Amino acid sequence: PNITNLCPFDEVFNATRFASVYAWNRKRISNCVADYSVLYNLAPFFTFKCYGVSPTKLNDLCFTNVYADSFVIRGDEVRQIAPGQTGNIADYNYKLPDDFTGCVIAWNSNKLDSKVSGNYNYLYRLFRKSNLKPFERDISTEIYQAGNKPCNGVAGFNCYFPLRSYSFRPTYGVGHQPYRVVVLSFELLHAPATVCGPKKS
């Protein structure tokens, strides 16, 4: 149809700072025209594995709305971001649903998020009472006490602080290097057809 203003695909993929994985951010892309060419043209990235659609033909189809997320994770565990996988971030931080129709993008950031002394701006949750229903965020910082005696906000055996801090260093191997991840989640109900890419006539 009509409408020509480009979607803000540069505010998310060029942002200097990415929010930590435990408290991720949610962005709405609507009322614009998408341009997926730039994504795989400019950025040298790996693992463009998308679910529910072939990466080649994202231009022809029209979509209802686009939801953009973003965070940073460890290198060896990037495979955990997929339905049916089990892991610390999958169980406690970010869980994908069984029925998913969208893509994931992951790229290395060893030249951005690496500190000689050690980065401490990125944190992940380590343990929780139960799993998480898909698309849920947590900001809780209260102590989870596994001991019978109530620690009640103190430090002691059988009690641990829920959060743990990453520490990225240039001397680490490729396995532990940080990776920036952005997931795009779609829905193909195709009633309004508002936010789809370029087509003529």
């Epitope: 200097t16 700072r17 030249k111 951005l112 998020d113 690496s114 500190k115 000689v116 701006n121 240039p170």
Partner: antibody
Framework: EVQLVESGGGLVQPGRSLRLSCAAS????????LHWVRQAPEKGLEWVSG????????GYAESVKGRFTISRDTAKKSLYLQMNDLRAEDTALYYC??????????????????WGQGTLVTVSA | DIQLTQSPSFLSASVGDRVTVTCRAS??????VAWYQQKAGKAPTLLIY???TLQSGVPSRFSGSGSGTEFTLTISSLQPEDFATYYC?????????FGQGTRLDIER
């Protein structure tokens, strides 16, 4: 255009405090680290202080540590370097600079991009 | 901490020549180094970062190289506005340290 303005400088005497103000415009204040630098006349350059994006990593020079206070406020887009126990050694021109990658130092990409015109501070008996 | 030394304190040159400034460190700082140019009575501006990557709006004549504890800044061709002062900066630790400064002069 990105602009930084320094104010509050002038002449003081030893043993008295002072305050400055580095107003910023033209860029998002909350996604960049800032530093305070000083330069003596015809004596090269010298670093004074720096702050992080969320005021979590602060570093001072030995000869300067324990005497001054750096503080950033995002409400008014301001950076303040509160002064204490001045001597004649601190008479210099002060620059307020903005780092480019939201954190102090150690990262691969770092550099002082935009430098303010600075203000003159002299201490004397 | 880590000390940095400018090899030429002052260096005379003429238009269209080749010049090099050697900023030598004490410890191995990998490639966390930068260079700055200060005009006559003006606030210094950035020239190069990581000694290899041009930042923005900088003439292609400027270049940099180095590794370990040695760095060099290269000017392919000299221009009348190139007469200024040059500083080198460490970026490995947290007490940052600037070089003693290199001043360029006309040749006559």
């Amino acid at each position: 255009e990105v602009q930084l303005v320094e104010s509050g400088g002038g002449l003081v005497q030893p043993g008295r405090s002072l305050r400055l103000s580095c107003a910023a415009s033209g860029f998002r204040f909350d996604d960049y680290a800032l530093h305070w630098v000083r330069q003596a006349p015809e004596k090269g350059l010298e670093w004074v202080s720096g702050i992080s994006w969320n005021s979590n990593n602060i570093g001072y020079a030995e000869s300067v540590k324990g005497r001054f206070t750096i503080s950033r406020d995002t409400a008014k887009k301001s950076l303040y370097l509160q002064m204490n126990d001045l001597r004649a050694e601190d008479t210099a021109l002060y620059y307020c600079v903005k780092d480019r990658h939201y954190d102090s130092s150690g990262y691969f990409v770092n550099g002082f991009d935009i430098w303010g015109q600075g203000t003159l501070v002299t201490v004397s008996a | 901490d880590i000390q940095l030394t400018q090899s030429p304190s002052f260096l005379s040159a003429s238009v269209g020549d080749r010049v090099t400034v050697t900023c030598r460190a004490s410890q191995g700082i990998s490639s966390y180094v930068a260079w700055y140019q200060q005009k006559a009575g003006k606030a210094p501006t950035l020239l190069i970062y990581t000694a290899s990557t041009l930042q923005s709006g900088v003439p292609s004549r400027f270049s940099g190289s180095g590794s370990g504890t040695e760095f060099t800044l290269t000017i392919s061709s000299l221009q009348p506005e190139d007469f200024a002062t040059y500083y080198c900066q460490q970026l490995h630790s947290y007490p940052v340290t600037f070089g003693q400064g290199t001043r360029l002069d006309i040749e006559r």
